[model samples]
Target: MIINHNLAAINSHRVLKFQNEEVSKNMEKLSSGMRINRAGDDASGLAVSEKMRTQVNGLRQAERNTEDGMSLIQTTEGFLQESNDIIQRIRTLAIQSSNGIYTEEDRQMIQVEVSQLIDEVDRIASQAEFNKMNLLQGDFARGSRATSMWFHIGPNMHQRERVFIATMTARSLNLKGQSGELLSLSTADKSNDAIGTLDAALTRISKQRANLGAYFNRLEHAAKGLMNAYENTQASESRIRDADMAEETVAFTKNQILVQSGTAMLAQANVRPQGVLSLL
Candidate 1:
């Protein structure tokens, strides 16, 4: 051995410092519960995990939108059902007026009730709102026709579900004469005509209700799909980002042994200098 240079000590210290660095990394992983604390730890895994995180957040947000869309449909269904009940009542009154036993006064009295019910229908349409947006008179019930509404329920913006909501209004329901004017119930003949118009209106509303039911089903299936995607993707990202405690603990213990042994051996190297003092 060269007396001037303590090569053994230098070598032992180099290995001890290296072991200490590994122990530091192991400790960081254990404390943070993350495998890749920095870019240098796992560059490619971090990039992949980051991309999946964006997708996970997007899917979660889409679930929120789906819930709101479902709520909108539920509100529209409630308003539509109320109008359906009123229309049925008016139809019953029309049938009563068409009976020959009732007098003109009776007929006129029924007409008054029918007129009031029609006003109520219009009232519900005008007042029904969700999120400050008119539900019955606006998107869901505009101009007596269906409007296309898109609900995004996926990570990608293009992944959308298109739903149709029908418009609801008294005038739009087409309870009118040939001139598109409101039909009344002054006489029995007019009452008979009212019955026909009422039938058509009920048919229109029935069809729209069926459309809403289909929309509800579609939204339910879409919500389920989004949930599955979010859960699976989150697990995938966890596999990349999260530390394995079982494996990390073992590595830390191994590093501890190497560090302790290295220190003791380095001390022995320093004490070896005293062995050379024998020659002095």
Candidate 2:
């Protein structure tokens, strides 16, 4: 029962330090809700989580790609619809002028409407935008410089392929305010002849619309493919990084018990050193 110069004090200090360490480790696991907070916790989990993070980020970018494709399609479609309407109106004016009942002077009046409609069509084409990207007006109208259409289809980290669409090459028709060909068309005596020219222009416009449709279709398909790829990638990521709450809950409970038991055992170990004091 010797208490002076107690050997138990030394043992108690060592056990307390070890017990505190165990408590701290268990608390860290609880607070973070992660299996690998550090390399010491799980080296393999860290590697796997990094891969999952990459996939998650890529998936988000893929979603943006789909949005961009949809916006481009909508913008182009709106401009094309306006173009079609203008051409149909031009065709109707041609039919009116073809009637011999209207004199050259009367036909000239109808040509005024035709010129205005042409200007309107030009305006619509020139102003279409999808996030500042021009849809129809062609590159030359914006500037002499070429409008290069290139967009990313996949994650930057993945080094995925980029799709390049049509480039705008030449100057667009000037129809607004003051223009060369437009004002001349407005003064024509034989409005029927101008209408005939418009028919050919209509054919060209139709061809362009068809080409735009095809390009839009390709973009849609690519966007859909990207979305599917992103979904699969995210699924793979979740499998590796996402924790099962039920499984974690069970592990947490078990670990809590182990920590308590370890602390209790450490406390017991401290008593062993006190036995030496009994002999003193």
Candidate 3:
């Protein structure tokens, strides 16, 4: 006994110290509600969840950004429609002027309305805008004089919807004279030319307007897919990172009882030395 050691004290401190370490960690998991709280817990899983989170955020932003671009385009289309209507009115005036029964004075009166309609077209072109984003101005095209807007529709920068708004100026529509002039309805031949010009303008508007029509549906479908991707990614990431509260709580309770019994065993082990001394 003099040379021997108190094996109970040594093992009790060592084992209890070890047990406390696991209890501390278990407590952290229960309180924080995270299974993979640190890199040590799950290295690869944490890495994957981090990447998944970025995608969730990207999809969310892209979904909303697409809508903003649609609003701008929608605004642009409405104005184009208004201008189309104005051009149609000018065509009718041109036809009226072309009639042989109408004298020069009657044609002159009809020509006056056509000139006013031309001015209105130019005005609408300048007026078409979406919160300071000019839609009808040719300045937004992909050129030295143009400013192209690349819309965000996906997670990466390369995933974009490239767009260049064409200028819809009355002169640009080619409803004009040789040099520094406007279309004239005062003469019969000029009225015929005016009718032809209006047709050309209608076709241009039709083409651009049709293009935007497709854009609306395209962006709608994109948002639908993105929403699913975001939701699915989030669900998967949650499973990998979040703690199962029911399992964690049950384990914590059961382990608490085990530690209690282990301490009791250590107490009985230490008391045996005193009982032996009493016998001596």
RMSD of each candidate? 2.3, 5.1, 2.3
CA-lDDT, candidates in order:
0.85, 0.61, 0.82
> In candidate 3, what are the lDDT values of residues 1-280, reduced to their tens digit?
5316788767886777777777777899999998988779999999998888888899899989988878877888888988899988988888888889989999888878877888888889877778876677686755636467778999876889877667688877876555848788999988887888889988988888887778777878988888898899889989888899999888888778767877887887777577557657
Q: What TM-score would candidate 1 get against the native?
A: 0.93
TM-score of each: 0.93, 0.71, 0.89
* Span of 10 residues, lowest total lDDT, candidate 2: 166-175
Using TM-score as the measure, name the better of candidate 1 and candidate 3.
Answer: 1
Pairs of residues at least 3 apart in sequence or in different chains that clash in candidate 2: none
What candidate 3 gets wrong by more than 4 Å, as runs, is 1-5, 142-145
lDDT preference between candidates 2 and 3, better one: 3
Pick the lDDT winner.
1
Off by over 4 Å in 1: 138-148, 176-182
lDDT of 1 by residue, 1-280 (tens): 4779999999999999999999999999999999999889889999999999999999999999999889988888888999899999988888888888888888888778877888888888889987787766657433435455678887785988776666677876865345745557778888888888899889988988888888888888988989999999999999999999999999999999999999999999987977767787
lDDT of 2 by residue, 71-126 (tens): 77556766677777786777777767777677667767887887777777766665
Best by TM-score: 1
Off by over 4 Å in 2: 1-26, 132-135, 140-145, 157-179, 182-196, 262-280
| TM-score-based ranking | 1, 3, 2
Question: Could you arrange the candidates by lDDT from highest to lowest?
Answer: 1, 3, 2
Question: lDDT for model 2, on a 0 to 1 scale?
Answer: 0.61
